[model samples]
Target: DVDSEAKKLLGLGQKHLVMGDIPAAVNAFQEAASLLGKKYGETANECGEAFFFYGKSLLELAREEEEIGNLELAWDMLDLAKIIFKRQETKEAQLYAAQAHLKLGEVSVESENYVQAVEEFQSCLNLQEQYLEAHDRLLAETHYQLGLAYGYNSQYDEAVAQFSKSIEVIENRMAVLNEQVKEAEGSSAEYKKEIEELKELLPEIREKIEDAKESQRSGN
Candidate 1:
C-alpha cells in the first residue's frame, strides 16, 4: 500500500512536471522519495525509481534557480539510484544505472565541472556499450555528451574523436538499420523519433568537431 501510494505520488509529480508546475512536481517527488526511503531504506532497490525521479525533479528546480546546493543534492540522489540499480545487476537495472550516470553528468555539466562530467558521461557510455546495440540512439547520445564534456575540458583530440564516432553511429549505423526496418515493416515510425533526433544532432556534433580542430590548431 505504501509503495502504491508512493507510485501515485510519483505519477502525480510527473503530471505536474508535464503541466510546468515544477514546484509542485518537486514536492510530490520529494514526498514519494522520502516515504520510500523510510519504508525500504535509501539503498533498497525499491527506492531506486523514487530516488531517480526525485533527483530529476530537484535537478530541474536547481537549474531554474541556479542553486549549487540543490544540484549537489540532486547528484547525491541520482548516485544513490545508480548504486541501487548496480546492486541489482540485471540488464534492465544496469540500463537504469546508465540513465542515472547520464543525469549525474548533466548535473556536473550544469555545475561547470567538466572533468566530472567527462567521467560520468564516459561511465554512461561504457555501460550503454555493454548493453545496447552499436546503432542504438542512446549510444550516440552518450557519445555526443562525452564529446561535449571533452571539449569543455579542452581535450580537443578526445573531443573530436568522440564527436566523429557519434556522427558515424548516426549517419552510417542508424541509417543502415533504418533502411532495413523500413524495407521489412513498411513503416519506419518506430525508428523515426530517435532517427530524427540524431539527424538533428548531427550538425551540432560536426560543428563541435570543427571547433575542437580549431582549438587544436590554436594550441588551446
Candidate 2:
C-alpha cells in the first residue's frame, strides 16, 4: 500500500500543478519523493520515476520563482532537475531536460544572438529527439523553429532536413493515433472523432514535407 500511497501523492502533485497551486504541488511531490525513497530504493522502478516528477514539480516551482525575477533560483532548480532526470535514463527525463534547453535557447534567440540560438536550438533538437512519444508536438514545433533559423542563415540543407523531420514526426504521430482509434471499439464516437481531428492538418503537413524534400533534392 505504500507504493499505492506514493502514486496517489504523485497524482495529487500533478493535479496541484495543473491547478496552479505551486505550494500544494511542491508538498505533494516532496512527500511522494520521500515515500518512494523510503519504501523503494531510489533508482528502482517507481522510485526512479519519483525523482523525475519531484524534479518536475521543483522545476515548476522554479518557474514561479522566476516570475518574481529571481533568475538564479531558476537556474539552481533546473540544475537539480538535470541531476534527477539523469538518473531515470528514460524518455521522460530527456523530455524535461529538452524543455529547459528550449527555454535557454529562447533566451539566446531573444538576445539577437542568432549564432548561439542555433547552438541551443540544436541542443533542443538533440534532447527532444530522445523522447518523441513524450513530446511529439513540442519536437515538431522546435524543429519548425530551428528550420526557420537555418533558413535565415541560408543553410538550406539543414533547413530542409529540420522541416522534413517536423513533418515526418507529425505523420508518424498521426498514424499512431489512428491505430489507437482503430482499436477503440468500446470508446465513444466523440472521443474517436477527437483523435481523428489531428488528421485535418495532415494535408498541409504533408505539403510541407514534400516541399522540404523537393528542396533537398533540387536545392532550388
Candidate 3:
C-alpha cells in the first residue's frame, strides 16, 4: 500500500513536471520522497531514488527562476537540491547533482569566480566518473576550467596539459562510441534475420490446423 501511494505521488510529480508546473512537481516529488523514506528507511534505495527526483524537480524550478532573471533565487533552490543530493549516495542522484554543480561552476566562471568554478567543476568530475558521457564531458570541462585557472595564475604549461588531456579523453570517447555502434549494428542485422525467419514460420505453423486438431482429438 505504501509502495502504491509512492507510485501515485511519483505519477503526480511526473504529470506536474510534464505540464511545466515545477512547484507542483516539487511538492509531489517531496511527498513521494517522504512516503518512500518512511516506508523504506536508510537501507532502501527507493528512498534515495525518491529524493533524487525531488532534487531534480527543485533543479527544474531553479531553471525556471533563472529564465525569469531571478538568479539569486535560482541559486538558492539549486543549493538546496545540491544539499539533498549530497546527503544521498545513489549513482543516479549523483549524476543530477553533478550536473547542477557543473552548471553552478559555469555561472561562477562567467561571473569571474574562477576559484569557485574550479571547486564546483571538480566536484562534478568526481561524481561523473561513473558515467561515460558525463565522465568525458566533465573531464573536458574541468580541463578547460583548469586551463583558465592556470592561465589566470600564469601556469602556462599546466594549462596546456589540462587542455590536452581534455582533447584526448574526448577523442577516446568518440572511438569507443564508434566501436560500440559498429558492434550493435552488426548484432542487430544478425538478429533481424533470425527474427524474420521466426516470424515467417509462425504463420505457417499456425495454419497447420489438421495437425493440432488431430493431436487434440487423440488427447495426447
Best by lDDT: 1
Candidate 1 TM-score to native: 0.80
Model 2 vs. true fold: TM = 0.46
lDDT of 3 by residue, 1-220 (tens): 9899888898888888789898889789877877876777633556544655665565566553344443443445455556656567777778777876766665555445677766777777777776646436567766676677656656689778878878888787788789989999999999999998988987777778767888899996
**Candidates' lDDT values, in order?**
0.90, 0.67, 0.69
- CA displacement after TM-score superposition, residue 183 of candidate 1 (Å): 2.7
Q: What is the TM-score (0 to 1) of candidate 3?
A: 0.55
True-structure lDDT of candidate 2 = 0.67
Task: Report the lDDT tens digits of candidate 2 across residue range 142-196.
Answer: 8887887777677899989989988987888888778878777646776778878
* Model 1, residue 45: C-alpha shift (Å): 0.6
lDDT score, residue 27, model 2?
A: 82
Which prediction has the highest TM-score against the true structure? 1
Off by over 4 Å in 2: 1-90, 185-220
Query: Local error of candidate 1 at 62, Å?
Result: 1.7
lDDT tens readout by residue for model 1, 24-134: 899999889999899999798899998998998888888545588899899999999999887886999999999999999999999999999999998899899998888
Off by over 4 Å in 3: 1-69, 130-138, 145-155, 199-220
As for lDDT, the candidate ahead, 1 or 2, is: 1
